[PDB]
Amino acid sequence: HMLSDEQMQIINSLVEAHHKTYDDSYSDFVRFRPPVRLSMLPHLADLVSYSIQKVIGFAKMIPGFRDLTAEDQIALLKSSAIEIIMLRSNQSFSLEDMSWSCGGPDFKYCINDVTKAGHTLELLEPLVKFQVGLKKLKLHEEEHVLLMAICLLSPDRPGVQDHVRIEALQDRLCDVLQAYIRIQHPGGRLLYAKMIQKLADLRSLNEEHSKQYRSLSFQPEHSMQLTPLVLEVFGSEVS
Amino acid sequence: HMLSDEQMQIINSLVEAHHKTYDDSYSDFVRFRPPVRLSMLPHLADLVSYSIQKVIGFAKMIPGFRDLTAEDQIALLKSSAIEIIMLRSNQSFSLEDMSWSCGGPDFKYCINDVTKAGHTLELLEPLVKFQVGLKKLKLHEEEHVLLMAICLLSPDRPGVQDHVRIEALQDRLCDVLQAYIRIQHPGGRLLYAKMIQKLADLRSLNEEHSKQYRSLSFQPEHSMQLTPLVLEVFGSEVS
């Protein structure tokens, strides 16, 4: 068994989409309001807002995403954006430091940094355990981007209209991922099941983040520190 | 002739209100998104947003402002905020440099800096001429804060309900200013008329800024760079 021409074209475009939207130099970060050690909410608001723009760019290059209706595109992004940021952040995460390292000690985020942005160990503990278990998977970049696309293209999200179309798109991506792992990932007989478990964990992380984000968004002295894009994407408006 | 006890109490509280809300060290500025030389819109958005918070703090300490209804307080601030920022910015303005110097070459703003925030010489020329003519007045701090309070307490602004109350408050402040100048300002026989002319110029500056701000606010790639407070205060929502 091997992968088809169409299956690897999907992988090609998804890999290119991610390289174009994830900048390993992190040099854009000096443009954010600086970190301060809710001391850290300005910096992390800007970080997340910047990351949302990159997730929108990645999404737009997923085969078939741009052909969905504008509402479905919004629906999928409003529900999944925080999950994709959590998944994509694994690339900067270090097992050795148990934190996210983004090219410079100013842009090294530990758990305590995120408590100074208004969050609690009720979210930060499962998040760090998620990152470490995901890092231990040692995913190929191919598998990493496929999982982001699969996560994004979930039809079981609030607001989606074209359930049938989104599922067919996600089905094809899962097919690609299962085949890639069997053929290209030595010893990956259990990998696909683990990755689908991580998608389950993200739903739980999403739920907890939304809960804690409501606290921020309901206190104007904190919500005023957010960005207009963050207010939109994480807000409760429905199209 | 001399000033009454009640007149100088007004001056006392207005001077204290301004010292508490204008920080001559400008050390808070390192918290703004950095300047970049619409390169400068992030930094100037943060600068203006910070300055709005200080104008609200100053307003709250004007005798009688806090006893107005919440709507009138909002109405006066939404219409006058940009004018008070223009007036209060004269304190950092230099005739020698023709620019605003805020403790550090990173926080020195020339006209070209503000064109990189989306504005045109149609606004920036009258603004710089306003600052230089206002600086040439050599106002006492007493006169400076009285003019900010008078500007803020104008009843002829859209949205105000209690015309009669706001005018009485502004009337008392004008009385204080006229008396202060006659008694305490050597050679100020023409000063009060000039200061009231500057209030006229601010209306013209306000008009032009609102026009150019509409361009920013209508293009989402620029409006997303603004702050939630700036969006509120300069926005067109009416209570």
Binding site: Q53, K60, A70, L77, K78, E232 | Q219, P220
Partner: peptide, 10 residues
């Protein structure tokens, strides 16, 4: 509503 998202989504 969703003014920025619409613009970013082209």
């Amino acid at each position: 509503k969703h003014k920025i998202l619409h613009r970013l989504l082209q």
